[PDB]
Design a protein around this ligand. Structure first.
Ligand SMILES: CCCCc1nc(C(C)C)c(CC(=O)OCC)c(=O)n1Cc1ccc(-c2ccccc2-c2noc(=O)[nH]2)cc1
Lengths: 14, 247
């Protein structure tokens, strides 16, 4: 849910 | 150990050189004129050659810096093996603290380099912007002058910002045990690096550690300052939006 509430940040990590 | 602590310091220094455009070594040489000169902004006229203009243009590099810090984080040994949810938490709560550390390198008592050193904005001009915008930078300037009197170089700063990213007490962290065991190891690298890089400053480690709490409160006071703007000043970049929400 952290990666769902931070889609831009989550995508910069992958 | 020790020999491996030195290898980690070199690894982080390399990564830091690769991720950030302006090192402290370049910035200082620009600020002191020793470089082989930035445009100087001191009022509205020298800017166009208004507080919203500054405020919105500042978001530009801020977005780019979250990207650079995120890439630097991904190179910290162990970091990409952590639960991906906790990777988001550490970056959410650390990016601003890292911005303010790196911002100090670009500051003196009299102003701040901007646009990768191609400009210099004066502290007087920032402090003279209409309320409440005039107070946004002053807490950064007073932290920067104290922090620069420690006289760290980039090789020290590389490990220091790694220590800031790997804080075990961030809110919402799922599994702190693996985060705390990386930071303890980075704190060990920092302690050893400061012994080597500054054999004369007995308690520079202790002095440096106490700055980490200074940063935390600049971010707290900044966030409270920004809530008032959003209430009384009628945009924010979606990635700044996602970092500030519930922060
Ligand atoms: C609200 C927070 C204020 C911060 C801030 N305040 C100013 C002034 C108005 C005081 C400007 C100037 C500016 O753009 O206003 C245009 C007229 C500014 O950009 N930011 C954002 C910023 C973000 C990241 C970095 C950074 C980080 C890590 C490594 C390197 C850098 C870096 N080194 O050189 C760069 O350009 N970025 C630096 C600066």
């Amino acid at each position: 849910s952290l990666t769902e509430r931070h889609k831009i940040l989550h995508r910069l990590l992958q | 150990e020790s020999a491996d602590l030195r290898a980690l310091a070199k690894h982080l220094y390399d990564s830091y050189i690769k991720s950030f455009p302006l090192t402290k070594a370049k910035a200082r040489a620009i600020l002191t004129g020793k470089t082989t000169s930035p445009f100087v902004i001191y009022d509205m006229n020298s800017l166009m050659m208004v507080a919203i203009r500054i405020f919105q243009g500042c978001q530009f590099r801020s977005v780019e810096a979250v990207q650079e810090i995120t890439e630097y984080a991904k190179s910290i040994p162990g970091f990409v093996n952590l639960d991906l949810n906790d990777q988001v938490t550490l970056l959410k709560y650390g990016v601003h603290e890292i911005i303010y550390t790196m911002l100090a390198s670009l500051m003196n008592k009299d102003g701040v380099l901007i646009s990768e050193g191609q400009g210099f904005m004066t502290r007087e001009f920032l402090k003279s912007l209409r309320k409440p915008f005039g107070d946004f930078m002053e807490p950064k300037f007073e932290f920067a002058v104290k922090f620069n009197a420690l006289e760290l170089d980039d090789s020290d700063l590389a490990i220091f910002i790694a220590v800031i990213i790997l804080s075990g007490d961030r809110p919402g962290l799922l599994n702190v045990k693996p985060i705390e065991d990386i930071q303890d190891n980075l704190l060990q690298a920092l302690e050893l690096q400061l012994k080597l890089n500054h054999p004369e400053s007995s308690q520079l480690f202790a002095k440096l550690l106490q700055k980490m709490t200074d940063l935390r409160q600049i971010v707290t006071e900044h966030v409270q300052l920004l809530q008032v703007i959003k209430k009384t000043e009628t945009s924010l970049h979606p990635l700044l939006q996602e970092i500030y929400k519930d922060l």
